[PDB]
Amino acid sequence: TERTLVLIKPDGIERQLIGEIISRIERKGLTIAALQLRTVSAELASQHYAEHEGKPFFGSLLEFITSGPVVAAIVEGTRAIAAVRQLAGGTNPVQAAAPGTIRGDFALETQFNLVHGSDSAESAQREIALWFPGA
Amino acid sequence: TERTLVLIKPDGIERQLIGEIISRIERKGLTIAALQLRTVSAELASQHYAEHEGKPFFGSLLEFITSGPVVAAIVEGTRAIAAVRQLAGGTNPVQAAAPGTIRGDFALETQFNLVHGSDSAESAQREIALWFPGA
Amino acid sequence: TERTLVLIKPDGIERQLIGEIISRIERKGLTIAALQLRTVSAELASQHYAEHEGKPFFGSLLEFITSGPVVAAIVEGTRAIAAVRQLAGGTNPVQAAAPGTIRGDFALETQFNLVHGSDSAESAQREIALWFPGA
Amino acid sequence: TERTLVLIKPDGIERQLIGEIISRIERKGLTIAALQLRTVSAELASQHYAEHEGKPFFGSLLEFITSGPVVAAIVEGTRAIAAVRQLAGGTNPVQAAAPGTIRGDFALETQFNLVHGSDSAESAQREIALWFPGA
Amino acid sequence: TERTLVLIKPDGIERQLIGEIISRIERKGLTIAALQLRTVSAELASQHYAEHEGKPFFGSLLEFITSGPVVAAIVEGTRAIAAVRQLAGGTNPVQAAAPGTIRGDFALETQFNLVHGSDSAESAQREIALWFPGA
Amino acid sequence: TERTLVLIKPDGIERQLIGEIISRIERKGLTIAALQLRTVSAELASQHYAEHEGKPFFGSLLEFITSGPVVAAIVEGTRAIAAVRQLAGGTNPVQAAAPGTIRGDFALETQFNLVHGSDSAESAQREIALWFPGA
């Protein structure tokens, strides 16, 4: 079994999809190991987005994650990592994401993607330590 | 943002899926700009199906759209055109349409496809003028 | 069988519940006889609210129905009138409306009631003539 | 607007209803002000259940809340208190709770009630201070 | 724990509600102990409806249960009997049944009630022996 | 129109998905021709899994199908065979099955696949004779 970090971003909250997203995870058979509505410091935001740190969309990327609170969580279970990304869909909700996924069903813009899921074991271990340093 | 024409055909109505379809559109983040249950004249039907005007399935194609009332609508929003076709699925509901789409979830026959969505900007502009000449 | 007028007010639209409401109606076994997204003139609004014409909440009552478009419809079927009001719930969504109803599930304020349904045969016949004078 | 404390108890979690419950809250128009999966100390449990402190069911009442983690939350909005209790249903899910409520739809036992909601302004203010002393 | 007999009548099947009904039962926490789509002999129908044997609606009552196949089942769990009747709603779907129940959400006529649930321990034991004499 | 055999395996039952699965079938427009919760003899299990009779996973394959009761059914309609497999998804729920399918939405393991659907006309005719020799 694996552990992956999941974020429900400020747009997912504005659109009232916290429970919808969590439900899909639960229904897949995965288990919520940690869960917390929290605010994001300027520091955390950048450390999170270091992969795309130096790039054209960095600015508004941080301003976004910091505009309102977010819901962070540790999702655990068999193939947690791949499964979550499976539920989430591709980055582009119209041309990439399949219908039935979170982004595929609710999203229209690459930017406002509603959700985040660790893209690899390497990332997951790094992001969990980052958002849930205690646990 | 774009505007696209959407039809909920007589079979979509017989099967009580008006609200189900509209909901999926709404949930995607798209907005219903126009909406009307209406009947179809012989003329409108053919002007609509002019693309496939001369073909083997034209007859019953018109007889169908004219058998009962239909629900016409203008759907507006970011990438309205592609998104709607994304929600609708491919023409063949079993071999083409993905599960999660409208046709993929409810349809079994290429003919009885429940729904219509403009396939391009060129078409949308033409079909909207056709169904909602005022608006 | 009966005919009743149903309104999905501007708040029902802002909250993306057109399809949700229509679906509940469909699922009850009732049939959408007429349906149209339309704007409301100052005149229509008052003629509609004549029952509560002279009262303390009249002003903002009209300003509301006229702030954005609404979805009007004629719902037909066995006991259409009572059934629709059954689905809609009592006027106060928290103290009157039962869970499971439209207002009971989605509403919090007596004012923002999302929906309207004719309260009697007398009213229905009057309101249908008013909103769908042709049909 | 009001603030009320909501608990999703260990049975609500075992039965995979976190998102289902949160969704119902969201859909009612209420907003999640705080949210956290957390464990319960022996002390917190009793301070929470002081109202029924001296009684026949106290023992297993505490042992339960402490058997696994729970999801605590602050729910905010118009009539937050009454509305939440409205969504939750009466204590007895079969004879009291109406269909459509959380308990009414999912529960069978008075003990395993899935959810908790502050029963009054007095309680809410006390329980929020208790579970979210910071916020 | 108790055992109760549940019938999904021919109208429940025509309206594609087998899974919807079963789901509601499952979700309540009850368990399907037996389940079978079967036809009804003239004899079984009357033995079932002996309570209302001599009455004005007996004829079409039997003709109905015998018009198409039905889905019979034994539902088991805590307060199975009351809970099932709770999910089913009162006999009259508009004036008696609450929204959120099966009849309350889908039915319009006292006759076409979609579902049946044993009304008492005495009945349950009698009807189970009748429909599932082996089990 | 075609006939296909569908199994809801013991894990589909443990996870309370009987009605969910049946519903998806119904909603696709397919019809339940036969349906029965039943136990599986050692013989039936192997005759069913003869295709993969001689293989590394045979043992626990039979032990599984025989651990608890299962729900067998004959599903009938246009392209019943392909459609059902379409609803079910690929064998591997994470890497193969698309979101929106049964396995895609609920499953995490190739072994615990919740459902079975005949993979061909040849198989269907053979498996129906096997599970429903009378009908």
> DSSP for E28-64?
HT-EEEEEEEE---HHHHHHHT-TT-SSTTHHHHHHH
Q: Residue B17's closest CA among B90, B87, B120? A: B87
- C-alpha B84/C-alpha B73 separation (Å) is 12
* Neighbouring subunits of B (3+ Cβ pairs under 8 A): A, C, F
CB-CB contact of F45 with F66 (8 Å): yes
* DSSP-assigned letter for residue F101: B
Cross-strand partners of C5: C74
Residues D108, D113, D118, D120, Cα dihedral to 10°: 40
CB-CB contact of F69 with F77 (8 Å): no
Q: Residue E39's closest CA among E78, E86, E72, E74? A: E72
Residues after which a C–N gap over 2.5 Å breaks chain B = none
- Which residue ranges of D make up the annotated binding site for ATP? 9, 57, 85, 91, 103, 113
- C-alpha B73/C-alpha B70 separation (Å) is 10
Taking residue F109's Cβ as centre, other Cβ atoms within 10 Å add up to 15
- C-alpha A126/C-alpha A4 separation (Å) is 10
E chain contacts of residue C83, beta-carbon cutoff 8 Å: 94, 108
What does the block give as tokens for F2?
């075609």
For E132, counting Cβ atoms within 10 Å of its Cβ (0-12 exposed, 13-18 middle, 19+ buried), the class is middle
β-strands E31-38, C70-77: how paired? unpaired
Mention every residue, 6+ apart, whose C-beta is less than 8 A from residue A77: A1, A2, A28, A29, A30, A31, A83, F108
CB-CB contact of A48 with A65 (8 Å): yes
- C-alpha E7/C-alpha E38 separation (Å) is 11
- C-alpha B4/C-alpha A127 separation (Å) is 41
Stated resolution in angstroms: 2.8
Q: How many residues does chain B have?
A: 135
Q: Residue E19's closest CA among C13, C58, F28, B100? A: F28
Backbone angles phi, psi at C81, to 5 degrees: -60, -60
Contact yes or no, A with F (3+ CB pairs under 8 Å): yes
Contact yes or no, D with A (3+ CB pairs under 8 Å): yes
- C-alpha C38/C-alpha C44 separation (Å) is 12
- C-alpha A112/C-alpha A99 separation (Å) is 17
Q: Residue A70's closest CA among A29, A20, A106, A36? A: A36
Start-to-end Cα distance in chain C? 17
Q: Which of B87, B116, B128, B131 is catalytic?
A: B116
What amino acid occupies position D64?
A: F
For C117, counting Cβ atoms within 10 Å of its Cβ (0-12 exposed, 13-18 middle, 19+ buried), the class is buried
What does the block give as tokens for F4?
């296909």
Taking residue B125's Cβ as centre, other Cβ atoms within 10 Å add up to 15
3-state secondary structure of D129: helix
What does the block give as tokens for F6?
């569908």
CB-CB contact of E97 with C79 (8 Å): no
- The partner residue sitting opposite E94, judged by closest CB among C27, C79, C98, is C79
Query: How far from the centroid of its chain's Cα atoms is residue D4's Cα?
Result: 10
Residue-by-residue DSSP string for B51-85: TT-SSTTHHHHHHHHTTS-EEEEEEEETTHHHHHH
- C-alpha D116/C-alpha A23 separation (Å) is 19
C chain contacts of residue E94, beta-carbon cutoff 8 Å: 79, 82-83, 86
Number of folded domains in chain A?
1
Its domain, for residue C135, covers 1-135
Instruction: Report CA torsion sign: F44, F48, F54, F56.
Output: negative
- The partner residue sitting opposite D18, judged by closest CB among A32, A33, A37, is A32
- C-alpha E13/C-alpha E71 separation (Å) is 8
A chain contacts of residue D71, beta-carbon cutoff 8 Å: 35
The reply to whether residue D105 touches residue E100, judged by beta carbons under 8 angstroms, is yes
Q: Residue F65's closest CA among F112, F15, F117, F126? A: F112
| Experimental method, per PDB record | X-ray
Question: Which segments within chain A are labelled E, that is strand?
Answer: 2-8, 31-38, 70-77, 115-117
Residue D94: CATH number of its domain = 3.30.70.141
